[PDB]
Amino acid sequence: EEKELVAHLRSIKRYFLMDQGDFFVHFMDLAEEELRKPVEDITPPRLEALLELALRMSTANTDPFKDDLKIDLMPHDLISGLEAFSFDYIVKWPLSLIINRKALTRYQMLFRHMFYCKHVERQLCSVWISNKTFAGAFTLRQRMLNFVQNIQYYMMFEVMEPTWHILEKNLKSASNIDDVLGHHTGFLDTCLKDCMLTLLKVFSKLMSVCVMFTNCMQKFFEATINKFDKNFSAHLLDLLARLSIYSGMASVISR
């Protein structure tokens, strides 16, 4: 009731779990050019001045706790400039026992994995308007875009939307803090399992060809488009292969 916790986690799903795309569609639209610069070349007083603006202009303005978002440029990527960006969140003492540094980097691990897929299909969809006024590269773009759109819909409406709805109900039947601490870290170690975060490093290389493909089309050749097809389709038949050998993790193939 006082210093509420359930009305305090929904202020995290709005930013970390990317439940509101009205703040992102407006933030990357501002800080795109100033993130492609390499690291140790961008001024952090500029990004915070862009984050602080992207909120109040969007629909995230109606939030009591919006003043707790800080930029934190991590040193190592999801094992530069753009692949080293992630929010940071600060809380007071009484609410810190629940959401601590041990259980906040996990919120910060499964965010970058969803900012990376959100970044590529934001540009891979951007090359679509450049070609709209040589004719065999479209049938490959259809194969790539329909794969990242099929990962995100699996990662939002299948893993992080159902598991969160459990936690909301699983906190009304709690009896003590030693249980709320069990239903929270019991929600994070489940998301990082149904997601590919825990190995499946071929996903990282598979997204590598997609960003390169957008780059090639950004310079506007006839012999390299067919190379990407043989390269990208080879990695996808590897992803669908390992995702089949399991005892969810089997419903992904139907996605």
Next chain:
Amino acid sequence: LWHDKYTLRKSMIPSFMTMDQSRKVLLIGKSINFLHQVCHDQTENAFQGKIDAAYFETSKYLLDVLNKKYSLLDHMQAMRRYLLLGQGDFIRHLMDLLKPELVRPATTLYQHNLTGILETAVRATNAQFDSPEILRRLDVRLLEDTGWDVFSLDYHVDGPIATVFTRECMSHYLRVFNFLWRAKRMEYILTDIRKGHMCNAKLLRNMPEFSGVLHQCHILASEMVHFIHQMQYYITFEVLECSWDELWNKVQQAQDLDHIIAAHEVFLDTIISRCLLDSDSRALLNQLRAVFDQIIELQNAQDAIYRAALEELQRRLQFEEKKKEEEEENKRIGEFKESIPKMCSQLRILTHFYQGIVQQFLVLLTTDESLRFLSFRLDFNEHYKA
């Protein structure tokens, strides 16, 4: 906390307490010691009246805390609906979904896949409207071939209620569940064959040369479905509905949780006895298995005679629809008529051996008394016994 940790010392009993009175104190002490730890709850002639006063109050309270805080009775009924197939509606759907899986060998079978199927059945059938607690314990286990030899439900139970089942009732129910699982797939096979004949004659009713041998395929079925559909009744009325009635009658009147154990323990010694799963009735069950096998061999010797008639019918369809040559097929049609008496000698020798194993089965029943009600079910109208 019941079977051990308490011993009646025969040496240090005072002479002025009769040997029976010394077993009412060891039972009142045990009833209160067990009420605290496991159940997790906290509260001459006048001498004889004190023991009984401490008995007709403590034990009567032990059942109340064991029926309201744990619902010991609501599990006995629920452990009959599922573990003893007493539901029927749920086991029907569960045998339709495990069919595509269990046909494969056991090596490719993994438990983590079947649970999603079991969970689907409990949702579709009427078993969804049920206490969520008892549904938390109902799961699957994999006995250690074919998928129809290693599948069985478990319904594990731990805690205070585990003092009524004691790891032996769970080693007896599974000993029963196999006999009720076999006698349930041997019936859904025989209603599938009967379903095939209900579509067979609706297609090839134009070949009068085939109905002569096709007829023996029907009679052998209806002579076989009787033996199964009749023994399936002896399971309901003579074993389940009768031996369970002598349990719910000695529970609504029993008390002190030691007339309940002894009433539920003998309830598992009649079902084992009224079914043929005893130790000295071994010659009978192995005799029944042979009859259970002849039902499978019919299904294999039927689709062969079924499909071989659909191929010849399909060719006979295309051999005239595209044209509307004539001599090269009459030898194929002519030889097809010549293979018919070969198949007739199969169903003529399969039947003559099926009757030789049933007429031998009945002789073994005249051996130990409730079985006499079975010999009447099978031998009704005296079709056997000449």
Next chain:
Amino acid sequence: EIITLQLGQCGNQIGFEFWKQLCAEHGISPEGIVEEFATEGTDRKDVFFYQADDEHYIPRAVLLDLEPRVIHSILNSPYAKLYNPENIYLSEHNNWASGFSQGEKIHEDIFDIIDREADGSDSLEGFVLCHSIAGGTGSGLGSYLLERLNDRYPKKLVQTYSVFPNQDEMVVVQPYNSLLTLKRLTQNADCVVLDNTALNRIATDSFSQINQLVSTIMSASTTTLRYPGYMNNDLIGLIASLIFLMTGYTPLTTDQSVASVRKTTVLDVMRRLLQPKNVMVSTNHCYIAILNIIQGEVDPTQVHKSLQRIRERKLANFIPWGPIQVALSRKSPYLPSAHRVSGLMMANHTSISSLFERTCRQYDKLRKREAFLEQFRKEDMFKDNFDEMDTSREIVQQLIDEY
């Protein structure tokens, strides 16, 4: 699950009163709402009904008819809102050939409706057909639907409640329609004969009451499927245990004839189900199979004793070349149990052959003089010749010989 295909005025009504009986049994309000007392019900409803987001339940029924009047009256009944307007079909604008021609003409929409209904069920088991074999609508339309259904769905059961024309009472063109419908029934139907003559005979000794009795028969036949138990938990189980049929029901008593509350054992009921009088339809002919479904309290010891005594009394006759069944169910918890124990019987008996021998005799009594063939020649099917008729007659003759 199951679907119901009712054709012609006979079938349309049959369906009306069958669904009336069903909703009465399951505590379904006329509008499709569920009564408060039945909120926690245990009865299975998916078999004949599917619920809706509005909490109302919709029958898995389709209405077919060559004429509007009957269904229009149905939709003016208090039960009108219950049915699905989408499924109901009415011809925009008495012969079998015409009926089959229309069936060829209106294939698309009918099978659209049937497919839509089918895809809403996970475990559809078979089909139910209610129609009359004499009138032009029922006969021809059922023929066409059976043909195209057995073609379309080769893995579903097809059950029918076929009403046969009265014979003691003199459709003038009934022999042709009956013979053709029988051809189609043998050639495609998986498995309940019905006749007005004996039905009204037992009723005596309006169509509303006759079809109320018929719906009673249908509901009692489907009871155990509706109410899951231990044995006989599927229609295929029913069919396998028997396989043409005839039926009889013991407690066929008026609402005014409850005054004689006769102590009704199971033995007396099962006995009563055997007599030719109770067989609702009109050479040492014998049985092929007998099934008795019993509702109410029942002791299997009583059942065994009744079976033993009847077997000893040899009141029945069986085939010499082959080796009954008594199933038990539970009454709906709602309708009054005016009967202590009740019994329904479905049997296969060779005597039914006589039916066809009559109709064949009827048909042969016309084909020799070419009576009322003018209309048939109009339709395409009988435009050139009538070989269809000859094949149908020979098929029926073959069936009689087989019996």
Next chain:
Amino acid sequence: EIITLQLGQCGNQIGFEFWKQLCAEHGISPEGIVEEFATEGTDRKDVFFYQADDEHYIPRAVLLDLEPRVIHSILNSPYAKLYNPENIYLSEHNNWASGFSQGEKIHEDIFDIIDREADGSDSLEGFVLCHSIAGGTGSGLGSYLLERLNDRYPKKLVQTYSVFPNQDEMVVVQPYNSLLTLKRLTQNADCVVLDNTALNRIATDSFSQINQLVSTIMSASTTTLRYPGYMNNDLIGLIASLIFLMTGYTPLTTDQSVASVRKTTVLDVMRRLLQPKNVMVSTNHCYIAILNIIQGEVDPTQVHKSLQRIRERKLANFIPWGPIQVALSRKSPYLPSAHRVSGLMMANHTSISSLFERTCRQYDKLRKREAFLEQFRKEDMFKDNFDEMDTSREIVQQLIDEY
């Protein structure tokens, strides 16, 4: 943000009822005031409306017309005060050439209005056009605006709801206007075909109701953009996932047809969106893309199951040379949720080619005899020759060949 350009009587009305639907959804009063219950609303309003210092909200709409009567009637409606009088434009004083000539004549004021509206939005995303392709006003004016807009704004989307002339019902000069408008659509339009024939067909089985349905389609198409969620948070996301289109909506039910509250899953809806009957528009032709937006409670497990079953049942056909999409949204919190779950479908399918083949056939059926060319010669564009017509016809032929 977005702008709406509606032309001709058709477009003017389309806009009227589209904004009626929008204000109903977002709880916007007819006068532009906001209701008390909607004060704390979470719905995004910038997309179609911009608020004013007086707290009222103004649509990002512009009214264009060659004639005053329609808009004059609009301004006599209860919704009159809502629109912006500055943006509305009326000609002071039925041919495509005349329409394009006027468009050349009145460039300045129209683009003044468009620029004023554009500069009031930070993140304008594209354009929306509503018009009819047959009448003189819509066809020519839309042609001119599309040309000069694609020239002016080379970085904005252009979406249209083009209404096609009825064909089963015999504009006498429709072939010319339709062909020219199609030329311009291919040559400049970024991306929703519409026809009166099939639209009224589904309506059956006044313009007020037809365009109410059309506005329903438009609003359901723009729902998720209006209501931000997780995926598909932009129009460009929509377009990329598909790229000519056709549409269908399941709960197209009268206000009187709510009596049948049918239990409506997601599976049944998404299935219904596939049938040609529900496609509101009228060689083994196949699909190119399918999108289904679902409103109401939805379980992604149900969606996966429906997708699996439909894929296995192979009810659809796809291109052999290339490898659908199911997006979910939330209903407005205000309008009654008479439907448990609802579905809208937008697809690209090759069969649409037939449309042009008809119109081409129509046009070729006239160009051989020079019918009704007298008026066209009057205008400057067709004063010398008609090479415009030949180029347009060849472009449409090229598009058909490409399909």
